[PDB]
Amino acid sequence: RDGVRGAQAVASIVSFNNTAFESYGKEQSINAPVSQEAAFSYVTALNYLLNPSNRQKVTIADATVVFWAERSSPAEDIFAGMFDPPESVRFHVLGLSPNAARLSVRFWEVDTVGHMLDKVGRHYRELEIIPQFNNEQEFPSLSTLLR
DNA sequence: CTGGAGGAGTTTTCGCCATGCTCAGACTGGCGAGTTCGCG
Numbered sequence: 001r002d003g004v005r006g007a008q009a010v011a012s013i014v015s016f017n018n019t020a021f022e023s024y025g026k027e028q029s030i031n032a033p034v035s036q037e038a039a040f041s042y043v044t045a046l047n048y049l050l051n052p053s054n055r056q057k058v059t060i061a062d063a064t065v066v067f068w069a070e071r072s073s074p075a076e077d078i079f080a081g082m083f084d085p086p087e088s089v090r091f092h093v094l095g096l097s098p099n100a101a102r103l104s105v106r107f108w109e110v111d112t113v114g115h116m117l118d119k120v121g122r123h124y125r126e127l128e129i130i131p132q133f134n135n136e137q138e139f140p141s142l143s144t145l146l147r
Numbered sequence: 148c149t150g151g152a153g154g155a156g157t158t159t160t161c162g163c164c165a166t167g168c169t170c171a172g173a174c175t176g177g178c179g180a181g182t183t184c185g186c187g
């Protein structure tokens with residue numbers, strides 16, 4: 001509920017529980033070396049970002065999406081980007097999906113603006129038609145169309 | 148002949164919620180000008 005949705009109670013990104021996944025005679029996490037404090041750091045950061053109290057998380061389809069910058073109010077409006085369609089690093093975007101007890105990365109972007117017009121823009125421009133009344137609204141919501 | 152055990156195979160413990168309406172008309176509008184053949 002308060003973490004990655006649909007995954008096991010405790011999940012991990014790195015794990016080598018089965019022999020088929022080992023190589024060169026290594027074993028366990030030693031199969032990929034990382035300093036202990038470094039491992040702690042990013043895990044804590046990821047846990048923090050997952051906290052619902054901080055408005056930097058959103059669920060789309062099956063994948064949970066997390067983003068961060070020095071400010072987040074505009075990107076947070078992507079909530080309507082699907083719910084009701086219309087110095088610091090800027091807008092890292094990460095989307096991951098859950099396996100049974102381990103996580104996988106779906107996509108990864110670092111672009112600015114946050115534009116998704118590639119599909120939405122095409123989607124809307126395909127729907128263009130002159131209206132009948134003068135008081136109609138240009139951008140109908142999917143709910144209205146389906147109804 | 149018996150041991151210790153490294154490896155292969157099976158069982159246990161882990162922790163455990165949520166998303167929200169709507170709503171209305173126009174308009175009235177006039178095409179074009181034409182010519183047929185002819186003996187034994």
